[PDB]
């Protein structure tokens, strides 16, 4: 009778189970900030020519 | 590009009545895993995701 290496099929594991899909990592590179500021304009209360 | 597709063919009534042959063509897909043997997708290690 014919003799040969028996064929064994691996089993177990898990394929396409409980898809998560969360690989994103937040963060990027762009400009830092802007150094801008302003004062409260200029007030003027003067009349009568007090020298 | 085998001079069978790029050769102009005149109308049927003209001297050149040759028709363009229909032969299947194959195009390799250049990907990062196909760039080198050392790089390959671990399909067994990534069952959760779909490719």
Distance of alpha carbon B8 from alpha carbon B14, whole angstroms: 12
Q: What residue has token string 């990592």?
A: A25
Q: What is the resolution of this structure in A?
A: 3.5
Method: cryo-EM
DSSP state of A15: S
What does the radius of gyration of chain A's CA atoms come to, in whole angstroms? 40
Residue A13 φ/ψ region, left for φ over 0, alpha for ψ in the -120 to 50 degree band, beta for the rest: left
Q: What is the chain A residue with the closest CA to B47?
A: A15
Which residues in chain B have their CB less than 8 angstroms from residue A13's CB?
44, 47
φ and ψ at residue A31, rounded to 5 degrees:
-65, 160
Q: How far is A14 from chain B (nearest CA, A)?
A: 7
Cβ contacts of residue B41 below 8 Å, gap of 6+? B33, B51
């Amino acid at each position: 009778i014919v003799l040969r290496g028996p064929t064994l099929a691996p089993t177990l594991d898990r394929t396409a189970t409980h898809t998560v899909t969360r690989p994103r990592a937040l963060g990027s590179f762009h400009s830092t900030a802007g150094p801008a500021k302003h004062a409260a304009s200029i007030m003027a209360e003067c009349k009568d020519e007090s020298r | 590009n085998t001079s069978d597709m790029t050769n102009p063919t005149p109308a049927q009534g003209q001297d050149g009545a040759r028709t363009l042959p229909s032969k299947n063509l194959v195009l390799p897909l250049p990907f990062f895993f196909s760039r080198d043997c050392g790089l390959a997708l671990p399909t067994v290690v990534l069952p959760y995701n779909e490719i």
